[PDB]
Swiss-Prot record, chains A, B:
<keyword id="KW-0547">Nucleotide-binding</keyword>
<keyword id="KW-0997">Cell inner membrane</keyword>
<keyword id="KW-0762">Sugar transport</keyword>
<dbReference type="GO" id="GO:1990060">
    <property type="term" value="C:maltose transport complex"/>
</dbReference>
<dbReference type="InterPro" id="IPR003593">
    <property type="entry name" value="AAA+_ATPase"/>
</dbReference>
<dbReference type="GO" id="GO:1990154">
    <property type="term" value="C:enzyme IIA-maltose transporter complex"/>
</dbReference>
<dbReference type="InterPro" id="IPR003439">
    <property type="entry name" value="ABC_transporter-like_ATP-bd"/>
</dbReference>
<comment type="function">
    <text>Part of the ABC transporter complex MalEFGK involved in maltose/maltodextrin import. Responsible for energy coupling to the transport system.</text>
</comment>
<comment type="similarity">
    <text>Belongs to the ABC transporter superfamily. Maltooligosaccharide importer (TC 3.A.1.1.1) family.</text>
</comment>
<feature type="domain" description="ABC transporter">
    <location>
        <begin position="1"/>
        <end position="231"/>
    </location>
</feature>
<dbReference type="InterPro" id="IPR017871">
    <property type="entry name" value="ABC_transporter-like_CS"/>
</dbReference>
<dbReference type="InterPro" id="IPR015855">
    <property type="entry name" value="ABC_transpr_MalK-like"/>
</dbReference>
<protein>
    <recommendedName>
        <fullName>Maltose/maltodextrin import ATP-binding protein MalK</fullName>
        <ecNumber>7.5.2.1</ecNumber>
    </recommendedName>
</protein>
<dbReference type="GO" id="GO:0015768">
    <property type="term" value="P:maltose transport"/>
</dbReference>
<keyword id="KW-1278">Translocase</keyword>
<dbReference type="InterPro" id="IPR027417">
    <property type="entry name" value="P-loop_NTPase"/>
</dbReference>
<dbReference type="GO" id="GO:0016887">
    <property type="term" value="F:ATP hydrolysis activity"/>
</dbReference>
């Protein structure tokens, strides 16, 4: 699958801004982004359930616009297509293969193959009325798998991320991937779901693509403020800073606290200009226990959460509007109202310009 | 607030099994448990919206059964009491203080006080039709706050948990606590919410009280298997073991893997009996990088999750049915199918008997 300047608009309203994507075979892709960003319309377009106003959709290697959705090789899981009561799980899954003209031979052979990957063999000849919710969901997936598609497409489960039925879905999805290894495209609004299942993630915002990449790439190198705060929770901290110097690929900024300390960041530096007002980002997990000298931020403890596996502190630093959120492992016994100090590692900091674009990190990391 | 053998039954069906609780003044208590455990019925009983079949309910220090719900000093928040359209936020909040016979003096004085803590002073004389969902929720709270209760009672928000409206609620709840310091009782089915807001937590199961205590107490010392796997996620690992010895407050168990290694655990030991079949629990966060000798568990990597802040590995050990789940910080680069080894620390292990009761833990954890 490959997208080329694909756009979707009604009259003059643009819901999908010329999207460019390149999905390599076998990849598990997930479209993520806030409500109404256009993740589902984009999916439906690939499926053929919505028209593409301009642009090219390549599936396999050949243009698929103009081609009937059935002959594209794509398969969408129709989450709301009610099972045909008074029909066996097998009859339901094979139903579609009937009007098409398939032979009992292929039918009762492709039905036994999907019946294995989805664990339904022992439920095949059963009435829907006797199936649980968790297994009715699987019959739907099996329904789209017997048509033997080359691109599996699934949209957001109308469930609710902790809703048992959606946890099932999530496990089945990954199981199915590590089994057939076929190309898949999933849609969700939940950042965690994305970081968990994806091979490649495409963050969407206001109909445009904010960024595309591996989970770890989005994590360590967000291209802008939006992505920086969309992946990871609790959310990245943002502190206001001013540029005071510039070397080759470095950039020295000044911290807001009194005594305005200066720190160098291994950042892009391309075009910055001394005196500019920028935004410095540092994730709560990456702050340090302050035992380590260098740059130290200090305030008064506003909140303390003991979660067992870790501890989250909310500190209020004098000369910063929003509370700084700290995160460490195990205990760390502190009382509200007490003064707490934490370290600021320049190698783990991010720098964002006025447009919110990130002045690239030059550090190195695991993926 | 104090409960004493409080029971609730319909004919012979028992929905609340003699409950004992002792809520100290100012405490923020939260009732947690799975769907249908009886957490809401219990709250409604304290409120006076449901009768107590037997037992004693003390509020303040005096028996409150038999006393009209309005004169108990308790204030419930009615999430379904639709605002009176064609009435200002002040008229809605004071409404109930009208039929009661209040004077405009107290009315327009208690309405300005609650208007502050809830940030509504600037919206007082406004029509509901012009208020947003987030602020309508607050009017409801302000509604129950002007009656100036001594025990605040809030039930489960019909939202979800990621639902923006519920995140607001949660923030308001804690803000309100760190402000008036009054006794509060909240109900939820989400373990995380509980560990985050509570001063004290009471886990409920099938109408009984599984356990009561501070969040850290439930986490380090579950009283039984149920609690052990209800708090914390991903869930605690459970491995089958056999008792091979017994010293004074130390039991030696045998691990299921080949070469059946024996390990001593600083556990209760009261009544165990050599040869018994028991359950050993170890949380994912507490397993170790294996670099440390002692007990070593080894298998093949089935799943790897890169979440940025941490990494979750799913290993399959030969001679255990369920995948062992590991958890570590930062990266840990491993590929599926590869073999991985982790350490098992005796000091962080839990031991459960056949009844699921936690017979154990002498090891002191700072909290």
């Amino acid at each position: 699958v490959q997208l080329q300047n694909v756009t979707k608009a009604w009259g003059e309203v643009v819901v999908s801004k010329d999207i460019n994507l390149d999905i390599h075979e076998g990849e598990f892709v997930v479209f993520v982004g806030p409500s109404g960003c256009g993740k589902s319309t984009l999916l439906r377009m690939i499926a053929g359930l919505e028209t593409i106003t301009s642009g090219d959709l390549f599936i396999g290697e050949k243009r698929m616009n103009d081609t009937p959705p059935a002959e594209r090789g794509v398969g969408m899981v129709f989450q709301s297509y009610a099972l045909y009561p008074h029909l066996s799980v097998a009859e339901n899954m094979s139903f579609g293969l009937k009007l098409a003209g398939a032979k009992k031979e292929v039918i009762n052979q492709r039905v036994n193959q999907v019946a294995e990957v989805l664990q339904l063999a022992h439920l095949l000849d059963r009435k829907p009325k006797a199936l649980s919710g968790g297994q009715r969901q699987r019959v739907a997936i099996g329904r789209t798998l017997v048509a033997e598609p080359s691109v599996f497409l699934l949209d957001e489960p109308l469930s609710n991320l902790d809703a048992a039925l959606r946890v099932q879905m999530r496990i089945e999805i990954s199981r199915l991937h590590k089994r057939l290894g076929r190309t898949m495209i999933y849609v969700t609004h939940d950042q965690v779901e994305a970081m968990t299942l994806a091979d490649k993630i495409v963050v969407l915002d206001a109909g445009r693509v904010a960024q595309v990449g591996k989970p770890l790439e989005l994590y360590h190198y967000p291209a802008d403020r939006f992505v920086a705060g969309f992946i990871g929770s609790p959310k990245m901290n943002f502190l206001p800073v001013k540029v005071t110097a510039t070397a080759i690929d470095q950039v020295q900024v000044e911290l807001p606290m009194p005594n305005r300390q200066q720190v160098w960041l291994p950042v892009e530096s391309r075009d910055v200009q001394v005196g500019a007002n920028m935004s410095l980002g540092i994730r709560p997990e990456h702050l340090l226990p302050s035992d380590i000298a260098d740059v130290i931020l200090e305030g008064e403890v506003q909140v303390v959460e003991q979660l067992g596996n870790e501890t989250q502190i909310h500190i209020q630093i004098p000369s910063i509007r929003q509370n700084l959120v700290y995160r460490q492992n195990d205990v760390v016994l502190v009382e509200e109202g007490a003064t707490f100090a934490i370290g600021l590692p320049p190698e783990r900091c991010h720098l964002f310009r006025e447009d919110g674009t990130a002045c690239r990190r030059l550090h190195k990391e695991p993926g």
